Amino acid sequence: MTEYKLVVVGACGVGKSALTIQLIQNHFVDEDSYRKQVVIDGETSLLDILDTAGQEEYSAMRDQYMRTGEGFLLVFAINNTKSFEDIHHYREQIKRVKDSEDVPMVLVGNKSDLPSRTVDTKQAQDLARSYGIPFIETSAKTRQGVDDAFYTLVREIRKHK
Numbered sequence: 715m716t717e718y719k720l721v722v723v724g725a726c727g728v729g730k731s732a733l734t735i736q737l738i739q740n741h742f743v744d745e746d747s748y749r750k751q752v753v754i755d756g757e758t759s760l761l762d763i764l765d766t767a768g769q770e771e772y773s774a775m776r777d778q779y780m781r782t783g784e785g786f787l788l789v790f791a792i793n794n795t796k797s798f799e800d801i802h803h804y805r806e807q808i809k810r811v812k813d814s815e816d817v818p819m820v821l822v823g824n825k826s827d828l829p830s831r832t833v834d835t836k837q838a839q840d841l842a843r844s845y846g847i848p849f850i851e852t853s854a855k856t857r858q859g860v861d862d863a864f865y866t867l868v869r870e871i872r873k874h875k
């Protein structure tokens with residue numbers, strides 16, 4: 715059976731864990747690794763997911779997970795300008811470790827339910843256009859865009875293969 719190794723990257727506190735918990739466990743309340751079999755477009759596959767900001771203890775496991783990772787969610791929060799500014803560093807880091815220019819990625823703007831916004835949707839759309847990747851607005855709290863973000867990434871991985 716097909717397995718997809720997914721890595722969710724972004725600054726501390728953007729909601730990487732929250733998004734992954736919503737996907738896998740279907741809840742939100744206000745584990746760094748998750749594993750579940752799902753059906754996407756009629757195809758069964760196991761999602762093996764790591765959430766990481768890059769500053770975690772097991773660095774060796776991280777570079778490993780980066781080399782093996784087939785697709786990446788690049789996550790920022792719409793109320794965290796720095797987290798948006800950090801996206802380029804994460805994308806550049808992935809490219810370098812994968813030693814590749816065609817790595818499946820999706821840009822995710824999380825916390826879309828919050829009324830504090832400091833990152834414009836246009837800013838993110840423009841960035842994603844430059845990178846040639848999808849941009850999806852999400853809320854781990856309301857579930858907005860959560861399946862869409864991860865399933866879009868799986869579809870990007872299929873295109874690549």
Ligand SMILES: Nc1nc2c(ncn2[C@@H]2O[C@H](COP(=O)(O)OP(=O)(O)O)[C@@H](O)[C@H]2O)c(=O)[nH]1
Nearest residue numbers: 726727728729730731732743744825853854855
């Ligand atoms: N309102 C709201 N809060 C969120 C959302 N996603 C995460 N949070 C909260 O943001 C904080 C950080 O979330 P967390 O998943 O630990 O971030 P991580 O460090 O990126 O894994 C927690 O208090 C979460 O409950 C969201 O979409 N909306």
